[PDB]
């Protein structure tokens, strides 16, 4: 026979392999496909869809419908944050369970821009202005309107157009970020504050809630496939 030589790796089984192999059922009449609406080409396009963020994860609210609700009030103006959030899409509890994040859990590196959309679900007679803020990492995490106002931010007016989107632009030292909670690859801080305050007339519910959604932008990508840790089998 043709003189051949075995080189390293022969006989091994790498699960990530891609070769041809003999068929178990030759000449099997495969059933042709039909146009089933809604086919997906890549995982990222699921990522670009906006999913609701379980913000308030307090002992009482966690694992309950309420964790998706962020209560607002008509209290006089304060410079205190409404909600604080870390830019660790794949590792911070609040982001970790959104489709975006869940997806991110299947990869090791993440890169690109993200968008935060907020939905006011109070009454029509309710008015207000807010400041949603994204501060790149490295400094003191914002906790007062003041410092947050210095970073990237959208000032949102409550009105007929029910929702507002703030885009967190890709600002990173590295070409790709870690799916883990890490300092070198830290993402920054996301924060919401009252610009004015919530104002309602009489005979109007004084306290309301807000919904938040997060998704990827057309230039978001992930790499290095790994197994997730949000799933497991005991014995």
């Amino acid at each position: 026979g043709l003189p051949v030589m075995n080189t390293p790796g022969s006989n091994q089984y790498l699960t990530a392999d891609n070769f041809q192999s003999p068929c178990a059922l030759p000449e099997f009449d495969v059933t042709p496909p039909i146009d089933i609406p809604g086919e997906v080409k890549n995982m990222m396009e699921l990522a670009e869809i906006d999913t609701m963020i379980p913000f308030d994860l307090s002992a009482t609210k966690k694992n309950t419908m309420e964790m998706y609700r962020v209560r607002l009030s008509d209290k006089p103006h304060t410079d205190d944050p409404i909600l604080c959030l870390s830019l660790s899409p794949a590792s911070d509890p609040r982001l970790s369970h959104t489709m975006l994040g869940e997806i991110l859990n299947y990869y090791t590196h993440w890169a690109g821009s993200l968008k935060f959309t907020f939905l006011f679900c109070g009454s029509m007679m309710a008015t207000g202005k807010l400041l949603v803020s994204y501060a790149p990492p490295g400094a003191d995490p914002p906790k007062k309107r003041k410092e947050a106002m210095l970073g990237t931010h959208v000032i949102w007016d409550i009105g007929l157009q029910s929702s507002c989107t703030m885009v967190v632009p890709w600002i990173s030292n590295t070409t790709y970020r870690q799916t883990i909670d890490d300092s070198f690859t830290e993402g920054g801080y996301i924060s919401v504050f009252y610009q004015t305050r919530i104002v309602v007339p009489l005979s109007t519910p004084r306290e309301m809630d807000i919904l938040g959604f997060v998704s990827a932008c057309n230039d978001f990508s992930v790499r290095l496939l790994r197994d997730t840790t949000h799933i497991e089998q005991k014995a």
Epitope: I180, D181, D182, S183, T229
Partner: nanobody
């Protein structure tokens, strides 16, 4: 994160045994040497005990060797801390400390520097 949830605040007298435990169920780059830090409101926060994730690299602070030992359950996932013969000098708030990438507790061996996930805090009083 990992899960870090600790308890065990029993104000025992001087010379009794106390057990401290911190959850570490989820398996991230898991708590290597782990970490136990006590903050004495007279002093500040300081490192104490720590056994490597897999290996037997357990570092002990000068003040607690022999009396205080570290061990865990490589399955049930929780980190135990046997603190016996308690002095009144050990009255402080303890904390567990996840040091991820094992090398974090191989290079420096002890925790403190390579520690990203912080525990809750349990008050332990050892009085007369």
């Amino acid at each position: 994160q990992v899960q870090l949830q600790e308890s065990g605040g029993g104000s025992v007298q001087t010379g009794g045994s106390l057990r401290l435990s911190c959850a570490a169920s989820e398996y991230t780059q898991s708590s290597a040497c782990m970490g136990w830090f006590r903050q004495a409101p007279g002093k500040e926060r300081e490192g104490v005990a720590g056994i490597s994730r897999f290996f037997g690299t357990a570092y002990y602070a000068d003040s607690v060797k022999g009396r205080f030992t570290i061990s865990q359950d490589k399955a049930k996932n929780t980190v135990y801390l046997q603190m016996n013969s308690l002095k009144p000098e050990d009255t402080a708030i303890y904390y567990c400390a996840a040091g991820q990438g094992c090398l974090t507790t191989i290079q420096a061996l002890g925790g403190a520097y390579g520690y990203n996930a912080w525990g809750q805090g349990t008050q332990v009083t050892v009085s007369s």
